[PDB]
Write a protein that binds this DNA or RNA. Structure first.
Lengths: 742, 250, 709
RNA sequence: AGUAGUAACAAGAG
RNA sequence: ACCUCUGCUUCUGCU
């Protein structure tokens, strides 16, 4: 007797057991080594889908430019970028007519948001390409290096506070004949030694004033860094992703904000809406698209997938979209929205680490960077790479980058591209044929609903949709798309079978220990269980079991097994003592070797609150010591919020609410000085917060100096301290004497 | 008063020309920028990193201060902390055992007003503790995905209005130009000022808790029957697609 | 030319503050000299009232100490001004004015608003009374010596004099230079947002236009003016018919078997590649009180019990992996046994020649500089190794069969939860007595815990002992049906050097595992292993040989991490089956857990199609189905990689198409061979993918036959 | 060797 | 070889 797990599908329909088709207890795929091979593929493919268009040379950058828009229509079913402007405009006009006032309202709101948006908004953009150092950096550090560097070139818009004047400086910086900036330089130093020679040649990193030409800067400002995407599920082979620089970030926020305002009011968009709100919106839409089916007709649904989605979408079309959408807006805002598409139309792709060459006999290896990619006969590259590099040449720049006018980078204009997708869905019909289409859109993913008299006419409508999308530069995957009679379909990994079904496996990795800290992770753990009970059909038995699994993972992860256990370890030694010393052991937290108190009915209550009145007074005094050294300086987001790949959690602040040490690899790199740079900023900010206690909670505002604010606050504090009898004349005189020098 | 200490520190800082130019060139707006300047890097795989980190000797960073110094270097052969300092906190790095030592033999702090600070969480527990449970039945349930209030509130406000109220409670001198809200919620403000008077808990923590009981969390959930927040907070136990659990809150 | 006047008559401090104030109201000093003047005058008058006056230590006004009589609120940034105003109001126990004051008198304890008017002071006085009521004292001045103060105004006569003198002095100087008309004559300009494009960005935009446009100005007007109606219909009329979605109605006969090459006997059968043994495992059992202990001590006590196996120094080589060194591997095994058996606490292994070989010491290539590498003709970019193509192996089916089977042992370490109160909780606890028990007793569960606990300790050793070779026992704690606990020793493992920076960095792990399985019975399964015959055991009545499976293996931080989280295999399987119990419970109006598992007075035990026996469907229990899914989820971890990810994702399309056929929903397809191409390229050397492809085809066959009936 | 799989690790930096 | 630092800290150039 041989077991076959697929036989389960004989008894249970596949949607009803779809969770068992997701292997999410398995390791997700990671990349090793360089991503240059994948990035070069993207460059080749992107140009392959557009090379029947117009080729020219940019007189700004000298790069090789390819323009497929208004190019020759395709005569095959290969991926096409040859979008026709008039067809895009007609699609948008239809959307405008279908949604009166929406375009101007979206523009209005996006504009007024921009007007109140401050520069610090750009600190939450995650990893960012830093043009000063030509490396990826945190958003905040990249923003800071740009502002300080701009000051060296008579650019001080950032001081005004708003995002607009900072963006003004960004585009004006492109006119500067030279850009001066700070960057670390590795300077060789010959130091007097003690051995025979009496000298040793070290390499010291120290900040230096550097400068580059106007053209060199423009290229950097137009550049995007690239790398391989890791931990992406459900794919055999790896792919490249890009990271934008700081110059374009501000402009992209506004365009996506604009697109978001539109998407929120489109019945077809599965974006930005998410979770249960998405489920509700989509099932309502399916009901209507099914109810409208002519009596005695046939309704079909295409489970859709778009191929080479980003590679075929064109910046020039997105420029046309902003222009059309912002029709009734003031010129300054129309110009503002045009910048991001323009910068993308002239984007340059950095090609990554390059390739590694080796000698198996000598057991040697070396990294050949992208500038020196052709500093070597192509015979010495392998077969696939050799062919790539040949096709790369016409777009290759000697500094080791590649021109890339057409295409988008993976997921940059998500909202705006969704609007384009919906624009296609909004056509509904062609030539008054006896069918109507409609559907759902979410970036590359779509679902097409088609009502007709018979199914052959449905397929004609699908063919017309397929052909219409070609005119917008949208390419439907014929390999991964399928179609069937309305009633069941898939969309963004949500499975519908006369109603959306649960897919418990999708969320399964989130049940694990999150890795924020002991306190947060307990709250997060129980909350995940609680939410999955509500949303993803996790019954009470599985939920209770999930509590058990988590505590097990929790105890082994944080080495905090029960005090009555005999497991050994550094922490466990003290946990056992705590067990012996404590009377109210049921009041001990799990992290302190205490018993798990959690069940279904109390998942939503913080652990410390559940156990508070069971605690030994001396224990709770230690655990909740307000000046404990483990918590440190908090932010209201550091107490409440955590990421998942954001959810908020309820936890009491205590000694378990600690923070991990800073990664110390930087100690050995040429980025040493950022430590001193950080610690300097920190001192100033810490003292500022001493003067202004609300700084941590509400953002300080002001174009005046930090010093001026602190000085005036301390002068007033002192003055009123003296008159209220909190300060003696001796103190007040010294206080005013000190402030006098300042 | 801490005023004179602050002034002496400020004068100290201005001896260092690096810190001086920072305080001069950095606008109050730009405090929000340099606050977030650091060598750290958003962890893309925290669950992995934590399991890895918990196997190292000194994965935690302490706040530099006297309380940190009360933790001994070692305890019965266990290295609780190291002399090497963290790049971020500039304080000593320590083991997870250090946390356990503190909770076992550390200084006993003051928890006066704790229950008033976390009053919101204790009211959850009280609603559960005083609740009675009816029967559980099995049968089909029609759930509708509605926006519902997840947590019961002290007094619901828009985020802006709530922020202003919290400024009047915790940071009146920095609250800026007065609002209509200050007048409307004057009794709420007065009451919270009294309740939060003695606490030594950090104001930012107090702000977070005030925010939980003023700012509503209204999210879409599949619900059937009562949609009041005292039910929604227990929703995971009240119903599924195929069952009902009668619940009378306290 | 007032800007010249302002510079000569007012101090620098005053002018700066006035300009800053205008900036806060977003207004240009250079385009509004009149406003700049009025703000300068107003600010100075505030300072004129203040400059001279002070307070002594008894709170009495005098004229010249560091405590002035007046606080000058005007002239400083809003946030500072409000800080000052509220600090004063709160400190002196008075209400905070809703508008921003110009002065505060420390002696009067009153806020003051200051006014400057060209007309009547009385008019301006009562225009302020409307708005401030009487929250502040008023001090209105004019240029021709007129003025209006509130009844309790703090202004002394001498100060009033300086203010009016200074104002008239200014009035004279202005009219003397014909600048008074500039102040009177209206000055007002509309404030638009300022965003303008320089040369470079304008040029970049010009070359960002579609073909058919000369410049951006052309595109903008075009988009603004023209009606594109009919454009889509026109382009579709001239677009080639070769551009089509090529729809094809799907039929059962269109669905051929996937990956036909897995049946090709010209290929090698897929070998065993997992990190540890599974169904072939053998744990040396040693009864205990049931509580935890040092892993070295456990292994030492198990090996003391089975001392004949422990002391075996003369084994029999049975099978040898191609590139393995059986002498080094055996020496390493002896080193492990001797190290764990000794009295020392340390489990560190000496970096011997045989341990250096087994753990891959010094095998990483040397990094040389690119200049040297470029000039070296012999250094090339390696061709990438591709996963081999394998055929079905019988052992994968065997593993699935045995792991799905019940045993007498339980290995799960599930901790406590608070006692039940709500009926829902009681229901959950009663359900678990069926679900968790069913899984806890099956073979797969015990194998899972072996992986989980081993990866747990291996991860720790890898970080804590990076530079040390270390022997790590492979263990479990097991409980029989009588409740007696046993420590299980499946073997010993050697951790090599583990300076794991990158998450994909590899630590070599050499495994030595016990087994009753003779590798010669199914040699195709064991090409990676070097197996010794080391002894015997009386399992029941007769002997079974005990082998030692030796293998150089490896893992990384990621694989170790997900290993520690493999317990979640419980949830994925349990959620699926509990859902069915809840659906069944809904129909009949009571908890159907017992009825599904064991059957009822009114209900037959729930059965599932579980597998085949010489061609025919075989039914199985609800519990069996649970164990099969659980095992399936465990195999996802054990054999998880990109091949499994791709296979599962792409084949899921065919699954949903097959469902459409079964539902008679008339599915259509656009490129079927393309869809198959996506699936079949994921079928290489992953044992579970290959076996799933086989199972897929078998299942597909039965669905085809069932479609007819 | 081995891990692994379109390119890496099998220590790196001073 | 010896000592020091590092275990997600990014490498275009300085080289």
């Amino acid at each position: 007797m041989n077991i076959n797990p697929y036989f389960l599908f004989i008894d249970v329909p596949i949607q009803a057991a779809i969770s068992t088709t997701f292997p999410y207890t398995g390791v997700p795929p990671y990349s090793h080594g360089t991503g240059t091979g994948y990035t070069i593929d993207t460059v080749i493919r992107t140009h392959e889908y557009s090379n029947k268009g117009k080729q020219y040379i940019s007189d700004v950058t000298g790069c090789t430019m390819v323009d497929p828009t208004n190019g020759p229509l395709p005569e095959d079913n290969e991926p096409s970028a040859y979008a026709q402007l008039d067809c895009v405009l007609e699609a948008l006009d239809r959307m405008d007519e279908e949604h009166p006032g929406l375009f101007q309202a979206a523009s209005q709101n996006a504009m007024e948001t921009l007007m109140v948006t401050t520069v610090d908004k750009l600190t939450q953009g995650r990893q960012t390409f830093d043009w000063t150092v030509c490396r990826n950096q945190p958003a905040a550090t990249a923003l800071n290096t740009t502002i300080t560097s701009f000051r060296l070139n008579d650019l001080n818009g950032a001081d005004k506070g708003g995002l607009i004047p900072f963006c003004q400086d960004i585009i004006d910086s492109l006119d500067r004949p030279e850009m001066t900036f700070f960057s670390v330089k590795n300077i060789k130093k010959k130091l007097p030694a003690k051995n025979r020679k009496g000298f040793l040649i070290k390499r010291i990193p120290m900040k230096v004033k550097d400068k580059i030409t106007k053209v060199e800067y423009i290229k950097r400002a137009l550049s995007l860094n690239t790398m391989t995407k890791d931990a992406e599920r459900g794919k055999l082979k790896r792919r490249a992703i890009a990271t934008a620089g700081i110059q374009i970030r501000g402009f992209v926020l506004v365009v996506e904000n604009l697109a978001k305002n539109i998407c929120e009011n489109l019945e077809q968009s599965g974006l930005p809406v998410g979770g249960n709100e998405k489920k509700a919106k989509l099932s309502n839409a399916v009901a209507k698209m099914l109810s409208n089916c002519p009596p005695g007709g046939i309704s079909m649904t295409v489970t859709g997938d778009n191929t080479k989605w980003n590679e075929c979408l064109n910046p020039r079309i997105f420029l046309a979209m902003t222009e059309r959408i912002t029709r009734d807006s003031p010129i300054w805002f129309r110009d503002f929205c045009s910048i991001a598409p323009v910068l993308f139309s002239n984007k340059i792709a950095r090609l990554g680490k390059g390739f590694m060459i080796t000698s198996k006999t000598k057991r040697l290896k070396a990294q050949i960077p992208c500038p020196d990619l052709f500093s070597i006969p192509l015979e010495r590259y392998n077969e696939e790479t050799r062919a790539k590099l040949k096709k790369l040449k016409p777009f290759f720049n000697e500094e080791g980058t590649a021109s890339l006018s057409p295409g988008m980078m993976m997921g940059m204009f998500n909202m705006l591209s969704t609007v384009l997708g919906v624009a296609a869905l909004g056509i509904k019909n062609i030539g008054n044929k006896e069918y109507l289409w409609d559907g759902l859109q979410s970036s590359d993913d779509f679902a097409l609903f088609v009502n007709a008299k018979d199914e052959e006419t449905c397929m004609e409508g699908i063919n017309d949709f397929y052909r219409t999308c070609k005119l917008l530069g949208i390419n439907m995957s014929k390999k991964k798309s399928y179609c069937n009679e309305t009633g069941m379909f898939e969309f963004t990994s949500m499975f519908y079978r006369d109603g959306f079904v649960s897919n418990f496996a999708m969320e399964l990795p989130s049940f694990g220990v999150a890795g924020v800290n002991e306190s947060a992770d307990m709250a997060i753990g129980m909350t995940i269980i609680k939410n999955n009970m509500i949303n993803n059909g996790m019954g009470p038995a599985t939920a209770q079991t999930a509590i058990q699994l988590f505590i097990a993972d929790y105890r082994y992860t944080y080495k905090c097994h029960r005090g009555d256990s005999k497991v050994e370890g550094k922490r466990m030694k003290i946990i056992k003592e705590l067990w012996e010393n404590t009377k109210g052991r049921d009041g001990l937290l799990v992290a302190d070797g205490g018993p798990n108190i959690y069940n279904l009915r109390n998942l939503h209550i913080p652990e410390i609150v559940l156990k508070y009145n069971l605690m030994d007074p001396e224990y709770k005094g230690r655990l909740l010591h307000p000046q404990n050294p483990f918590v440190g300086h908090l932010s209201i987001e550091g107490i409440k919020e955590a990421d998942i790949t954001k959810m908020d959690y309820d936890a009491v602040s205590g000694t378990h609410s600690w923070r991990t040490k800073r990664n110390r690899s930087i100690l050995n790199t040429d980025q040493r000085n950022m430590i001193l740079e950080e610690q300097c900023y920190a001192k100033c900010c810490n003292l500022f917060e001493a003067c202004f206690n609300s700084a941590s909670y509400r953002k300080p505002v002001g174009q005046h100096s930090m010093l001026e604010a602190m000085a005036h606050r301390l002068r007033m504090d002192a003055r009123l301290d003296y008159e209220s009898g909190r300060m003696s004349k001796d103190d007040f005189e010294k206080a005013m004497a000190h402030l006098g020098e300042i | 008063g801490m005023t004179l200490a602050k002034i002496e520190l400020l004068k100290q800082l201005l001896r260092d020309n690096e810190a001086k130019t920072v305080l001069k060139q950095t606008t109050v707006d730009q405090y929000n920028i340099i606050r977030k300047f650091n060598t750290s890097r958003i962890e893309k795989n925290p669950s992995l990193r934590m399991k890895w980190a918990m196997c190292s000797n000194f994965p935690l960073a302490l706040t530099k201060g006297d309380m940190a110094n009360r933790i001994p270097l070692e305890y019965k052969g266990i290295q609780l902390k190291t002399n090497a300092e963290d790049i971020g906190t500039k304080g000593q790095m320590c083991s997870i055992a250090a946390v356990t030592w503190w909770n076992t033999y550390g200084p006993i702090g003051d928890t006066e007003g704790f229950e008033r600070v976390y009053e919101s969480f204790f009211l959850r527990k009280m609603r559960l503790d005083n609740a009675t449970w009816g029967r559980i039945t099995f049968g089909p349930v029609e759930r509708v995905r509605k926006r519902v209030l997840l947590n019961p509130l002290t007094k619901e406000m828009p985020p802006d209005e709530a922020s202003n109220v919290i400024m009047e409670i915790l940071f009146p001198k920095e609250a800026g130009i007065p609002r209509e809200s200050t007048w409307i919620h004057r009794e709420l403000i007065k009451e919270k000022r009294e309740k939060l008077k003695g606490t030594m808990i950090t104001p930012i923590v107090l702000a977070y808790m005030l925010e939980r009981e003023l700012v509503a969390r209204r999210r879409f959930l599949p619900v059937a029957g009562a949609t009041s927040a005292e039910f929604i907070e227990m929703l995971h136990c009240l119903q599924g697609e195929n069952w009902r659990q009668i619940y009378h809150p306290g | 030319s007032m800007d010249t006047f302002i510079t000569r008559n007012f101090q620098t401090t005053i002018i700066q503050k006035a300009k800053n104030t205008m900036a806060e109201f977003s207004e240009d000093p250079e385009l509004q000299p009149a406003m700049l003047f009025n703000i300068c005058v107003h600010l100075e008058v505030c300072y004129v009232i203040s400059d001279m006056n002070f307070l002594d230590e008894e709170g009495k006004a005098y004229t010249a100490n560091l405590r002035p009589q007046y606080e000058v609120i005007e002239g400083m940034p809003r946030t500072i001004a409000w800080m000052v105003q509220r600090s004063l109001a709160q400190e002196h126990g008075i209400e905070t004015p809703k508008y921003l004051a110009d002065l505060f008198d420390y002696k009067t304890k009153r806020f003051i608003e200051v006014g400057i008017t060209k007309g009547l002071a009385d008019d301006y006085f009562w225009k302020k009374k409307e708005k401030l009521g009487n929250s502040m004292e008023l001090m209105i001045f004019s240029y021709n010596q007129d003025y209006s103060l509130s009844n309790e105004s703090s202004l002394d006569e001498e100060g009033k004099g300086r203010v009016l003198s200074r104002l008239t002095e200014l009035q004279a100087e202005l009219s003397l230079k014909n600048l008074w008309q500039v102040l009177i004559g209206e000055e007002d300009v509309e404030k638009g947002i300022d965003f303008k494009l320089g040369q470079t960005i304008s040029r970049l935009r010009d070359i960002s236009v579609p073909a058919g446009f000369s410049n951006f100005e052309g595109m903008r007007s075009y988009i603004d003016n023209i009606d594109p109606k009919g454009a889509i219909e026109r382009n579709l009329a001239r677009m080639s018919p070769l551009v089509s979605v090529t729809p094809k109605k799907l039929t059962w006969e269109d669905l051929r078997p996937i990956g036909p090459h897995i049946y090709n006997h010209e290929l090698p059968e897929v070998p065993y590649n997992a990190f540890l043994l599974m169904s072939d495992e053998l744990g040396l059992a040693n009864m205990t009180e049931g509580k935890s202990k040092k892993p070295k001590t456990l292994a030492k006590e198990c090996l003391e019990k089975y001392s004949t196996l422990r002391d075996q120094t003369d084994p029999i080589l049975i099978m040898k992996s191609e590139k393995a060194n059986e002498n080094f591997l055996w020496k390493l095994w002896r080193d492990c046994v001797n190290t764990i058996s000794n009295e020392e606490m340390s489990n560190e292994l000496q970096k011997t020649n045989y341990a250096k070989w087994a753990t891959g010491d010094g095998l990483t290539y040397q990094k040389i500089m690119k200049e040297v590498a470029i000039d070296d003709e012999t250094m090339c970019q390696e061709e990438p190794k591709i996963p081999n193509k394998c055929r079905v192996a019988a052992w994968v089916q065997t593993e699935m069969n045995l792991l799905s089977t019940l045993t007498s042992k339980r290995a799960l370490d599930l901790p406590e939860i608070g006692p039940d109160v709500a009926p829902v909780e009681h229901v959950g606890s009663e359900r678990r007595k069926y679900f968790v028990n069913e899984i806890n007793y099956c073979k797969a569960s015990t194998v899972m815990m072996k992986y989980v606990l081993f990866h747990t300790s291996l991860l720790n050793e890898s970080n804590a002992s990076m530079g040390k070779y270390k022997v790590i026992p492979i263990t479990n704690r097991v409980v029989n049906e009588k409740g007696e606990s046993f420590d299980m020793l499946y073997g010993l493992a050697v951790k090599g050097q583990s300076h794991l920076r990158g998450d994909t960095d590899v630590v070599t792990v050499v495994t030595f595992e016990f087994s009753s399985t003779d590798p010669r019975v199914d040699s195709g399964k064991w090409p990676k292993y070097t197996v010794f015959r080391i002894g015997s055991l009386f399992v029941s009545g007769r002997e079974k040989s005990v082998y030692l499976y030796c293998r150089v293996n490896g893992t990384n931080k990621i694989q170790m991490k997900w290993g520690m989280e493999a317990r979640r295999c419980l949830l994925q399987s349990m959620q699926q089956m509990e859902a069915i119990v809840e659906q069944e419970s809904s129909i009949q109006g009571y908890d159907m857990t017992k009825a599904c598992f064991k059957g009822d007075r009114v209900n037959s035990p729930k059965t599932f199609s579980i597998g085949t026996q010489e061609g025919k469907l075989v039914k199985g229990s609800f519990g069996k189905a649970l164990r099969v899914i659980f095992t399936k989820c465990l195999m996802h971890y054990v054999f998880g990689n990109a091949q499994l990810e791709g296979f599962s994702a792409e084949s899921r399309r065919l699954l949903l198409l097959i469902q459409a056929l079964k539902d008679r929903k008339g599915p259509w397809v656009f490129d079927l061979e393309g869809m198959y191409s996506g699936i079949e390229e994921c079928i290489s050397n992953n044992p579970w993918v290959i076996q799933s492809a086989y199972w897929f085809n078998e299942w597909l066959g039965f669905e085809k036959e069932g479609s007819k009936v």
